[PDB]
């Protein structure tokens, strides 16, 4: 049943009673007290001075429990011949001898025990338990180095054949092990023990008995090894159970009820651990990356400003048309690592070497692109900076900046944006103490490098470059242009949904061994979602088609999904763009995987035996070599 035994003190209490039950202890059951535990293996100190005599509680043991603590005992008992050599655990534990039975009220809380009066409930003290588990693990610790030697013996040459059977003279095989087992092995010390230890765990390996001249099968797990056997027709039962589980282990952890939701869904339950993303800021098309800002080009204006850092060091820099900043608002607190290294940045009178670059945060009410003077920038700070080095590269007659790792990360906490009229801008540019001539340096920024972007808030997701509290996974399907997707933020909705939906794809592969252009238990749900869409009364030019074609289209379309999951959100993909196609896929994945009955696909069934029979030939191939180079009298 489970829980803890109880005793009744009310003497007139039946159910739902104030003070009916109390805990059972060792004064209630004197036997369940640690002086009456058998001193087998010498666990309890016999000398009377060291025994506590203080009461201890009682816990109920379930069936499955003893079913495992008994099983754990046999970990020792494969190696018993070796244990006796080590003079340890002479008498086996026998878990059940540690048990004890009462028929008293059983339960976790007394309210539940009050009506649970079982019979012959096994019981044990917590201290007697700890006396047991350590004993097993004690011997397991003792057998460690012996264990490795047994494995290296078995794995030196094939002791198991996947399918069928093989044969080889014994004197030949032991001799080949003589010169390859390490000298410091305990097979060297104790052969006769190892020999019977092997034969307990392999039906093939036997040992004829010199007494009566008899040889026999000795292994103990005969019932186990059957389920691991290919038949004349299909693979072993074991993995055929396993595989369909792992498919359901994925479809479960990918929680399809979310990725199918046609309703507003909060961001955190939909977000997953995102991945870093990479960009080259200069090269972007501005009309796409909606999270960028750019001071307009071609006005001739150009000026200088001075901004300090946390230390207060005053600097100088330029701003000019064409310069770009990121709009720090709603950038879903993020991280910036920019590597200027590998570019030239050399002017006719401005060498990049020696100068400094850095990040510059901004605060100014006027929108960024309307900046035209030093007055309106308002509040600004320099958060980080480095000093550059330049190196000559393969392209002869030039030099090239060495590696940089300008770091910075964004956190809304410090900024504390409460004024609904505030603006926030980040920018990487040359920085120096002295002023810069407006024409002696002519770059608009230094954003012409490699930018690696990494998220910090995994509980908040942007969509189309804009943060949002909730998302609707249904409506994302078939709404992205690959121009846009490359310019997406690393913690975008699709990013979390592309790989999450990819997680569905592995299941389909692990279940579907279908080739090109034929139906499949997971390609067919699309097919139904196609036929009915045809038959309705609608726009355009209607078209009928026989099911011979309709069936292929789904299979042709599904093969895309495993081939690339990201294509479903790509705009106007032939089949997967539509949502009704998408949903009908994400339910069959659940249902098909729940109706399989210990089966592999026809093509997987046929191939695996043939791949298996091929190996068995190679096993006799190796064994036949063992004999010729190690004969027998």
């Amino acid at each position: 049943p489970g829980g803890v035994p109880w005793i009744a003190v009310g003497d007139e209490t039946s159910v739902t009673s104030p003070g009916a039950l109390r805990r059972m202890t060792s004064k209630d059951i004197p036997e369940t007290a640690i002086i009456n535990t058998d001193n087998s293996s010498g666990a309890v100190p016999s000398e009377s001075a060291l025994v506590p005599y203080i009461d201890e509680p009682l816990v109920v043991v379930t069936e499955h429990a003893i079913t495992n603590f008994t099983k754990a005992e046999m970990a020792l008992e494969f190696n018993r011949e070796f244990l006796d050599k080590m003079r340890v655990l002479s008498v086996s534990p026998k878990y059940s001898d540690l048990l004890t039975y009462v028929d008293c009220y059983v339960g976790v809380s007394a309210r539940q025990a009050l009506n649970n009066f079982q019979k012959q409930v096994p019981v044990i003290t917590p201290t007697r338990q700890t006396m047991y588990v350590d004993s097993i693990q004690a011997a397991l610790k003792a057998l460690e180095k012996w264990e490795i030697d047994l494995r290296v013996a078995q794995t030196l040459l094939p002791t198991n054949v996947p399918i069928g059977e093989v044969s080889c003279p014994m004197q030949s095989v032991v001799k080949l092990l003589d010169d390859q087992l390490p000298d410091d092995s305990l097979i060297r010390r104790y052969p006769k023990e190892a020999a019977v230890a092997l034969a307990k765990r392999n039906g093939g390996i036997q040992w004829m008995d010199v007494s009566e001249g008899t040889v026999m099968n000795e292994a103990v797990n005969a019932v186990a090894a059957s389920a691991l056997a290919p038949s004349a027709s299909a693979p072993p039962l074991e993995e055929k159970s396993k595989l369909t589980e792992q498919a359901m282990d994925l479809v479960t952890a990918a929680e399809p009820e979310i990725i199918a939701s046609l309703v507003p869904v909060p961001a955190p339950v939909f977000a997953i651990p995102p991945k870093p993303a990479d960009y080259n800021v200069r090269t972007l098309r501005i009309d796409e990356a909606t999270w960028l800002r750019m001071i307009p080009k071609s006005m001739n204006t150009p000026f200088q400003i001075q901004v300090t850092d946390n230390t207060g060091t005053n600097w100088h820099l330029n701003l000019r048309g064409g310069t770009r900043v990121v709009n720090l608002d709603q950038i879903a607190p993020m991280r910036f690592v920019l590597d200027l290294g590998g570019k030239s940045y050399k002017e006719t009178s401005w060498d990049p070497n020696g100068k400094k670059v850095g990040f510059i945060v901004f605060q100014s009410k006027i929108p960024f692109e309307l900046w035209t003077a030093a007055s309106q920038i308002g509040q600004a700070t320099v958060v980080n900076y480095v000093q550059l080095y330049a190196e000559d590269s393969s392209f002869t007659a030039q030099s090239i900046i060495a590696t940089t790792s300008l770091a910075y990360n964004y956190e809304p906490e410090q900024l504390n944006k409460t004024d609904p009229e505030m603006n926030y801008y980040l920018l990487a540019t040359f920085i120096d103490s002295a002023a810069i001539t407006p024409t002696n340096m002519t770059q608009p920024d230094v954003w012409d490098a490699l930018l690696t972007m990494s998220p910090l808030s995994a509980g908040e997701v942007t969509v189309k470059g804009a943060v949002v509290s909730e998302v609707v996974p249904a409506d994302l399907i078939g709404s992205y242009t690959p121009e846009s997707l490359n310019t997406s933020l690393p913690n975008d909705a699709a990013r979390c949904m592309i790989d999450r939906a990819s997680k569905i794809a592995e299941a389909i592969k692990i279940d579907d061994d279908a080739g090109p252009d034929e139906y499949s238990p997971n390609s067919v749900p699309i097919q139904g979602q196609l036929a009915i869409s045809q038959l309705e009364t609608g726009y355009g030019v209607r078209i009928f088609n026989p099911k011979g074609i309709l069936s292929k289209i789904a299979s042709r379309a599904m093969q895309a999904f495993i081939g690339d999951p990201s294509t479903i959100i790509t705009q106007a993909a032939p089949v997967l763009s539509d949502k009704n196609n998408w949903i009908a896929l994400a339910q069959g994945v659940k249902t098909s995987l729940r109706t399989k009955s210990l089966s592999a696909g026809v093509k997987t069934a046929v191939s695996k035996l043939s791949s298996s029979e091929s190996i068995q030939n190679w096993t006799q191939g190796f064994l036949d070599k063992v004999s010729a180079h190690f004969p027998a009298p």
Copy 2:
């Protein structure tokens, strides 16, 4: 008890029995049917063909129905002698006689009635109970003119006195009735019916009987009169058990636990119906009223823009420095109504008469402070406009503009706020069909007016001209300047803290009767907070003051709170600036009322008495005038 009777069908059920019971019906107890009902008053017809012959549900009648429904009957019998004169209702209904005492499982639910079983329970059907009040109620209509003419007889001359007794010959007083009662009064027709009627409800009025030649008291409500009658030294009980009632009732409405909350509190629960406010935009200090936006001086330029109306009509209106607008953002929709009567707006080349003014709404990303051009208004629409009339005023030789009602109700769901850097502005200026010379009219705006803010919300509370969904009543104390209030919006937290604390302010006065510079149970919770504060060492110079000083300071301050409820949101209020003083007062009123024992103030107790015998003294002299001018033979 109460609820519904239930009859049994299984007879073998104890608890959680699914359907053991069944709703009893009038057929099961055929005494509760309308063919057996006592037809006293003759309500139900007496012809078989005109009778429902259909059963009805049963409802249980509880103690408090019987005590009151019957008690309602007696209010009829106070006027029996006229009812009978009208030959109606010869037999009084006797509510209880329409019941039948049964014993069954009774309860609102069959579940709860399952174990709730009773004995001799009153039962009635709805139709029977409906008819009973109809019998009562139709008589109250019958006495629709009698009772009015009854009261005027009592109210024409003082029949009741607050204290003591008075006297006047009955011969005289009746003679005063005859010449001052309307000829149509029912008492003119039926003198003796009135005479018995008044004697039942007034002990003083007692009639001699010619047979026995005796006379005695007659009133039927002597116990009731003993509640409203004062003692020779104490006020009446009823009006005391009535005052403490009001005071508690006001506090429970004021919800002291909110206005004493030390942590954040949501807005819609906190706020209550607001009152319209008024401001003078031209006269507010632009720094104080943060909900204002205005163009700097010193630009030297001036420009005109075209804006369309909802009807597509186009209009021209000019702009300059100091032209104030209002930030429609963080306003929690208001009603903007504008009046112009009483101003001049007359210029050397601009006669305001005949022109038009209107509210113009702006939508731009560009912040209003940095406008200079006509291409950066953004989106505009003349949301409303009205014509102008002019008349001459007390100032000789110049006219004045007449009443205007230019109104617009701000409503954010129209604005469709979607851009975090978008901006909204509202203007009030002149509008003309064609262009207007920027020079001949040099008013920056018409914002010199009497604008009335009317809130369109109660769940939305602004603070310091800015909205917030979370208010902390503790921190509103000592945080408003005498100016900052006069810049706030009507839907402010303070005006919500004020108009609520007034009821707490009003609550005190009904109980408390202190005066100048003496303590009270309600001024004392302040005083407890003062001793401990000065006792602990603070900052500056520690000073010491005996308790006599503290006692006055608390009462004086509590007078100041009663004098002006709005004294606690101020800044630097001498005593009430601190929350601990405010908090302790808040919790102290609840105790001070619940711990009264039918008590009343000590000074008032004398005053109530002393005032009353003056009323008696006045009354007697007035009765004397009756005998002087209606002398009995």
